[PDB]
């Protein structure tokens, strides 16, 4: 039922509303209309506030009422009649006292309590100092009489602290927050006494824990004096840390204090550390299996370990520098370094990431002390070399353990993700920057640091690990993969000569392990690792042709292996090796009389006959790299012709048949082939580079014909049966020939190197084939990639295409614009791309925007406005980048410059403020501020024409400030003139400090959400007023 209950002056009940809330939280499809009505109740005001919270599944209904009350205090509080404000003060304070002194807080969930407390802080935020003077004192006294009225107060302070020091930025104006920051500081001692008294005397656990918790939020700002020049640290370590239900809060506090970046309290830190360690060695014995304690632990024994990671890591990373200089501490530091090593064995990615963060820092700190190994051989008189640098000396044996750690827990290097693309095409994707790959990166880096300080140690670690697999028989796939991952991660960290000795031993014995182990199961896992290792050391392959040769052939053999994954392994390695040894395949090696490529090319079919489609592409890409090495024109051309001979046969075949019956380019199978042929053509091009032109040219024209054939076949199918058709085999297949065709076209022009030749031959046929086709397509059939493909070519060709923008923009621009000008949702890709294109043209072909008529130009600029009004972050940002850039492009041509200002200046200014004052575009904050600042800074000189009717009477700076003031005040009439005038003035003073300019904007966004009212005037003119001129006078000073 509707049950709309806004009926204002109807003496409306409470038993009804109480029912809807119960549905918004329990029922189902009903909740749709339940939420749809309560969200609406927020219309007139909150007279229901009293009757509701008063009347009473009820706390939920009271929580609701509180939100309304909460909104009132954050919105119209300042323009409330004083007596009414105070009416709420007592209404809340008492409501709290009532329910905060309430015998049973938890059942009337801490939720209702917490929200109430929050509302009080909401109120304090609005008057605490000026109109609630006795507050801080009263709540202290109240705490010292009632334990209950104390515990909750410890929560009231925690919230107030967060709201003033932790979450003020954005929700509070800059100057008001400082006034609050002071107010909290000027009267904090009184409150510190309270917490302190509680800690030393209070027998009650909850009250105490909530006081330690309220303490954890204080250590973010309280004057250092309170921490290091009191008994605070001593209290936490002796009293609260040793006991179970306090060990976490206690430690988390110590951790926050251990991270102070100051050089004034060197003594306190030393004792803080050694004092903690004692407690630690009593709590968690240095001989316990920390991993088991975790594996076999709950949400208490687990967090402690995590907090231990944070404490240990944060402290050593900071004050660990001074733990070395002293001598008395040189013992507790080793104990601490011992914990980390135990903690590091915890099967838990997030904990292991924390520890690693330290190790990487340690091995880095000792790498800049000395990057070199110590001179192995002792002195003639048997003494010690000192070769060992001062600091590393202390960590020597710990470092060895850390090397063991990296070698035993090494993460997977690469991350394969199998996912089928938007076609049903199954593939293998490669992640690039996942968190996992970052873990690997750090491990590799730590071990690469340690290997430089002592590579002998590294090689010994790895030789024992490798041996234990071979006969020590701690053999398993998981470990063997880890050992070889680690081995490969240090490639190039040794002297070449050492690397040679290392590699030959390592794989020689793996080559033995693969023989003793039986079953294609084991042998494949081993062979892959061998193949991974040999793939990581091109330096070694590039010096030993015979080996390289033997490796490649082995890969060619593995390419007929039917055991799972082997063929993917063998291809990955081959492309890898080709890339890094490309030169050795095209130049004749010792012992040969013909470049290896030849053998490879005269056999492509016998090698890849058993590979899958995608693998065949990866293989073609690999040979492509070899081809790219032959710099000699003549020979590279012959190589290329034969390289593309196999795929060409299919092409040439499909083509002649299409020149007899064009219904063939409609054949499912032949279209499947045209796709794969093209896909092959795309990879070859990616590797061969520019020289590949000889190929593209050979098929460029026909390829466009078929593209257009398919593009017209698809559009018709859609026009005849609606979008739906796109969602079936043949169409999705035809889409593929189009998309790869576009990949190929753009993919080559990118790596081309003769702009003009490209603009005079490979561009004009694009017009009729791809552009006017995109034009004639039905909206649902147009390819978004057409726009992005064109964007790329503009970026490359630049000035050489500036004369074709007319012809291009015709086809795509207006027609595409009409697809994205109704709302902000439909045709996403078309939005994104279209503006990458518009960006590019404006960026590298600006002259075009001048050639066209003012009527067309306008249509372009207003399209940009349209961009930065988007809620899709990327589209709106591209719009600013364009606008910001466009403004600068205009700064060049003196003539056509002023005109722009006379016509668009104010219009653009208005539009920018339109999105600045909107709560939905807060991510363009920086770009927003940048553009404005630039425009205002421009106002003080540049614009030298009349914006107004009169002439000199109003300098642009005056008309512009008044135009803005008018626009802002007219758009936000609840603001008082002072608010606005202040703002507008800051726009010309902060015009040379974007960061400052930003804050200014952010402040105005706060004041609009609030009705400041001509009444209250708790702003800060004189203060801020001059503070703006401190910046206004930095532009002409230095």
């Amino acid at each position: 039922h509707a049950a709309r209950q806004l009926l204002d002056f109807s003496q409306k009940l409470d038993i009804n509303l109480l029912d809807n809330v119960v549905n918004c939280l329990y029922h189902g499809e009903g909740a749709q209309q339940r939420m749809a009505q309560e969200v609406l109740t927020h219309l007139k005001e909150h007279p229901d506030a009293w009757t509701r919270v008063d009347t009473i599944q009820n706390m939920n209904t009271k929580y609701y009422g509180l939100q309304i009350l909460e909104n009132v205090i954050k919105t119209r509080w300042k323009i409330l009649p004083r007596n009414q404000c105070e009416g709420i003060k007592k209404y809340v304070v008492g409501l709290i006292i009532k329910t905060s002194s309430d015998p049973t807080c938890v059942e009337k969930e801490k939720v209702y309590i917490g929200k109430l407390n929050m509302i009080l802080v909401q109120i304090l935020k609005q008057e605490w100092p000026k109109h609630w003077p006795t507050f801080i004192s009263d709540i202290v006294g109240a705490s010292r009489t009632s334990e209950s009225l104390c515990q909750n107060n410890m929560v009231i302070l925690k919230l107030l602290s967060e709201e003033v020091f932790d979450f003020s930025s954005g929700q509070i104006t800059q100057v008001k927050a400082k006034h609050l920051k002071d107010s909290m500081c000027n009267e904090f001692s009184q409150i510190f006494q309270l917490c302190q008294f509680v800690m030393e005397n209070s027998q009650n656990a909850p009250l105490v824990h909530a006081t330690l918790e309220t303490l954890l939020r204080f250590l973010n700002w309280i004057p250092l004096g309170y921490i290091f020049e009191t008994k605070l640290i001593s209290t936490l370590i002796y009293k609260f840390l040793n006991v179970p239900m306090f060990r976490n809060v206690s430690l988390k506090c110590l951790t926050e204090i251990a991270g102070v970046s100051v050089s004034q309290y060197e003594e306190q830190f030393e004792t803080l550390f050694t004092l903690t360690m004692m407690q630690l060695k009593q709590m968690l014995p240095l001989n316990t299996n920390i991993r088991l304690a975790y594996s076999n632990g709950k949400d208490d024994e687990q967090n402690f370990i995590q907090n231990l990671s944070l404490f240990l890591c944060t402290f050593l990373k900071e004050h660990g520098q001074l733990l070395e200089k002293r001598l008395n501490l040189r013992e507790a530091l080793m104990e601490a370094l011992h914990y980390m090593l135990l903690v590091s064995e915890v099967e838990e990615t997030e904990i292991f990431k924390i520890c690693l963060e330290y190790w990487n820092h340690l091995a880095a700190e000792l790498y800049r002390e000395s990057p070199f190994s110590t001179s192995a051989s002792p002195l003639l008189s048997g003494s010690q070399h000192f070769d060992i640098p001062p600091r590393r000396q202390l960590y020597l044996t710990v470092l060895s353990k850390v090397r063991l750690l990296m070698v035993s827990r090494m993460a997977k290097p690469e991350e394969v993700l199998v996912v089928e693309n938007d076609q049903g095409e199954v593939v293998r994707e490669f992640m690039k920057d996942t968190d996992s790959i970052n873990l690997y990166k750090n491990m590799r880096e730590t071990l690469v640091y340690l290997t430089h300080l002592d590579y002998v140690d590294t090689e010994i670690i790895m030789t024992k690990k490798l041996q234990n697999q071979v006969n020590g028989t701690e053999w398993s796939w998981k470990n063997l993969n880890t050992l070889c991952w680690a081995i490969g991660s240090i490639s190039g960290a040794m002297h070449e000569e050492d690397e040679k000795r290392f590699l030959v031993t390592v794989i020689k014995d793996l080559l033995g392990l693969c023989e003793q182990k039986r079953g294609k199961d084991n042998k494949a896992i081993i062979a892959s690792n061998i193949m991974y290792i040999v793939g990581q050391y091109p330096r070694f392959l590039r010096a030993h042709w015979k080996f390289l040769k033997t490796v490649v052939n082995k890969l060619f053999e593995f390419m007929h292996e039917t055991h799972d994954g082997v063929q993917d392994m063998a291809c990955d390695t081959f492309i890898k090796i080709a890339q890094k040894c490309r030169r050795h395949f095209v130049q004749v090696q010792v012992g040969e009389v013909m470049p290896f490529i030849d053998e490879i090319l005269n056999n492509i079919n016998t090698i890849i006959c058993d590979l899958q489609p995608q693998q065949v592409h990866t293989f073609y890409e690999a040979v492509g790299y070899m081809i790219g090495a032959q710099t000699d024109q003549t020979v590279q051309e012959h190589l290329i012709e034969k390289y593309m001979l196999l795929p060409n046969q299919v092409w040439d075949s499909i083509i002649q048949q299409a020149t007899k019956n064009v219904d063939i380019l409609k054949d499912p199978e032949t279209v499947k082939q045209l796709g794969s042929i093209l896909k092959t053509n795309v990879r070859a091009c990616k590797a061969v580079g520019h020289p590949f032109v000889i190929q593209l040219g050979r098929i460029y024209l026909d390829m466009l014909n078929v593209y257009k054939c398919l593009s017209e076949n698809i559009s018709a199918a859609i026009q005849a049966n609606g979008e739906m058709v796109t969602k079936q085999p043949l169409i999705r297949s035809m889409r593929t020939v189009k998309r790869e065709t576009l990949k190929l076209i753009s993919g080559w022009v990118s790596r081309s190197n003769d702009p003009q030749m490209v603009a005079e031959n490979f561009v004009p046929p694009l017009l009729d084939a791809v552009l006017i086709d995109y034009q004639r397509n039905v909206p649902a059939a147009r390819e978004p990639e057409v726009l992005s493909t064109m964007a790329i070519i503009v970026n490359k060709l630049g000035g050489h295409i500036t004369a074709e923008i007319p012809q291009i923009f015709d086809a795509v621009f207006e027609c595409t614009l009409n697809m994205i000008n109704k709302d902000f949702e439909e045709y996403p890709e078309h939005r994104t791309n279209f503006f990458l294109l518009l960006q590019a043209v404006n960026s590298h072909c600006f002259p075009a925007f001048l050639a066209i008529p003012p009527a067309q130009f306008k249509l372009v600029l207003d399209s940009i406005i349209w961009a930065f009004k988007h809620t899709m972050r990327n589209v709106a940002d591209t719009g600013l980048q364009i606008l910001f850039t466009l403004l600068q492009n205009v700064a060049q041509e003196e003539a056509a410059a002023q005109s722009f200002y006379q016509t668009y200046f104010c219009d653009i200014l208005q539009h920018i403020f339109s999105v600045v004052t909107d709560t939905s575009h807060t991510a363009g904050l920086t770009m927003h501020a940048s553009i404005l600042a630039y425009m205002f800074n421009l106002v003080e000189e540049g614009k030298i024409s009349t914006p107004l009717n009169p002439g000199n009477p109003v300098n642009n700076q005056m008309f512009i400030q008044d135009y803005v003031a008018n626009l802002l005040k007219s758009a936000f009439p609840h603001l008082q003139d002072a608010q606005v005038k202040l703002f507008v003035t800051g726009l010309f003073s902060l015009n040379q400090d974007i960061p400052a300019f930003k804050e200014h904007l952010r402040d105005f966004l706060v004041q609009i959400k609030e009705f400041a009212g001509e009444d209250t005037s708790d702003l800060f003119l004189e203060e801020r007023e001059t503070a703006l001129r401190q910046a206004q006078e930095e532009k002409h000073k230095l």
Binding site: D435, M872, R873
Partner: protein, 173 residues
């Protein structure tokens, strides 16, 4: 086979809705149509210890489409904060979301999800994502566009709620 209340929060365009759709339909929404208020979505996973149901309260990220914001969280039993690696702003606001949430839910298994890992030009390097550490939250790198670590957030929350560190999804009828 009992269920649980899962509240999903984050900035706009974060991919909250898109993430949920993927799970139930398997389809991927390319368009950005902002959620007004909330949209309860029941999700089901089949584990080795009986079926499990998540009531996904896909809330809104935008400020004007807020709703009964903090009001939705009540009675929650786990949560998922989500940000977009292509926009740092959506990671710097995470603290704000975790705030409102714990002031309503004092102790509930939460997960932090960095969405959009598939987009090559990632503006939020992993080195920076450390907020979960001191607040003892779980974290994962995800992509609704590639099903990368697709089911991690839910698998983890299940481990906690059913008090079993060895629960595994299987998709048995």
């Amino acid at each position: 086979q009992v269920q649980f209340k899962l509240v999903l929060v984050g900035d706009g365009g974060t991919g909250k809705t898109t993430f949920v759709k993927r799970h139930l339909t398997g389809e991927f929404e390319k368009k950005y149509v902002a959620t007004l208020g909330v949209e309860v979505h029941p999700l089901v996973f089949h584990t080795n210890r009986g079926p499990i149901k998540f009531n996904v309260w896909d809330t809104a990220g935008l400020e004007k489409f807020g709703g009964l914001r903090d009001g939705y969280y009540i009675q929650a039993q786990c949560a998922i904060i989500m940000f977009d690696v292509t926009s740092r702003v959506t990671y710097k606001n995470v603290p704000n979301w975790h705030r409102d949430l714990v002031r309503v839910c004092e102790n509930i298994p939460i997960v932090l999800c960095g969405n959009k890992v598939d987009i090559k030009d990632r503006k939020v390097k992993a080195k920076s994502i450390v907020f979960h550490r001191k607040k003892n939250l779980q974290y994962y790198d995800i992509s609704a566009k590639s099903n990368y670590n697709f089911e991690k957030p839910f698998l983890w929350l299940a481990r906690k709620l059913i008090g079993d560190p060895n629960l595994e999804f299987v998709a048995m009828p």
